[PDB]
C-alpha cells in the first residue's frame, strides 16, 4: 500500500517508486522537486542513512532516510506545455522586455558597437559573454567546479 499524496520518511519507502517534494536536511521542509508535474525516482535503500535518488536534472544525490517525500508526481502536467501567444501574457506574469547584446552601444555590454550587426572578432573574440565578462556557452562554471567536484567525489 503505497498511496498517492501520502508522505513518510524514506526509511518506510520502497525502491523504484516515484516521489516529489523531498527535503534535503532531516525535517527542514520540502525544498527538492516541486514544480508542476516533475518526478524524482529512488534507486535503492542501503541502511546507512543515505538513499540514492535520481532527480529531474538527470543527476543523482543521497538524502538521509529520516527525510520525507510525497508519493506520486506533482499536479498540473500541462503548464510545461501551454504556449502563450502575445506579449501581454509575459507582462501579466511579471516579466519586462529583455534587451539583447548586439543592440547596446559598446559602453554598456561586452557585445556592443558595430556599424550594423556584429559582436566580436575572428581571432580576438572570445565567445558570447554575460554583462560581466563571464562566458555562458561551452560548459562554463567559473571555479564553482570546486564545489561540484567535491560534492560529487563524496561518492
Amino acid at each position: 500500500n503505497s498511496m498517492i499524496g501520502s508522505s513518510m520518511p524514506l526509511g518506510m519507502m520502497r525502491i523504484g517508486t516515484i516521489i516529489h517534494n523531498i527535503e534535503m536536511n532531516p525535517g527542514q521542509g520540502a525544498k527538492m522537486v516541486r514544480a508542476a508535474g516533475t518526478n524524482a525516482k529512488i534507486l535503492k535503500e542501503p541502511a546507512k542513512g543515505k538513499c540514492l535518488i535520481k532527480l529531474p536534472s538527470g543527476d543523482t544525490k543521497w538524502i538521509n532516510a529520516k527525510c520525507r517525500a510525497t508519493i506520486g508526481t506533482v499536479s498540473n502536467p500541462s503548464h510545461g506545455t501551454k504556449k502563450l501567444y502575445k506579449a501581454g501574457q509575459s507582462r501579466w506574469l511579471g516579466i519586462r522586455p529583455k534587451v539583447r547584446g548586439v543592440a547596446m552601444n559598446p559602453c554598456d555590454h561586452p557585445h556592443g558597437g558595430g556599424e550594423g550587426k556584429s559582436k566580436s572578432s575572428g581571432s580576438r573574440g572570445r565567445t558570447s559573454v554575460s554583462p560581466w565578462g563571464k562566458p555562458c556557452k561551452g560548459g562554463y562554471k567559473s571555479a564553482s567546479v570546486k564545489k561540484k567536484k567535491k560534492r560529487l567525489a563524496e561518492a
Binding site: 508535474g37 506533482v74 511579471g94
Partner: protein, 96 residues
C-alpha cells in the same frame, strides 16, 4: 473560489529585482499583477490523516493547492499539500 481561506492569506509586497538597498539586482522582472501568498505547510505533520476538501488555482507555485480538512491532530483544515497528481478528493497519511 472567491477568496482564499482567511487563515492563510498574507500579502508580501513585490520586489522588482531590488535588494535591501533598492538598486536593480535581478533584471527583467516587475510590473505584473498583485499577488498574495498562501501559507503552505511545507514540512509535513505528525502522524494523522485528512480529506482533500478542494483544489485551488495558485499563482506562485505552478501546481494547484488543496486545503485538507484533517480528521486527526485537531488541525481542522491546514492550507494544503503541494497537489499530488492522481486523487482530486481522497484521503492522506503524512506518516505511518
Amino acid at each position: 473560489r472567491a477568496r482564499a481561506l482567511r487563515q492563510f492569506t498574507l500579502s508580501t509586497g513585490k520586489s522588482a529585482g531590488r535588494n535591501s538597498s533598492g538598486r536593480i539586482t535581478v533584471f527583467h522582472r516587475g510590473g505584473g499583477s498583485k499577488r498574495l501568498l498562501r501559507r503552505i505547510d511545507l514540512k509535513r505533520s505528525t502522524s494523522s490523516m485528512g480529506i482533500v476538501e478542494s483544489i485551488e488555482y495558485d499563482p506562485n507555485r505552478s501546481s494547484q493547492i488543496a486545503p485538507v480538512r484533517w480528521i486527526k491532530g485537531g488541525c481542522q483544515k491546514k492550507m494544503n499539500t503541494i497537489e499530488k497528481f492522481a486523487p482530486p478528493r481522497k484521503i492522506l497519511e503524512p506518516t505511518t
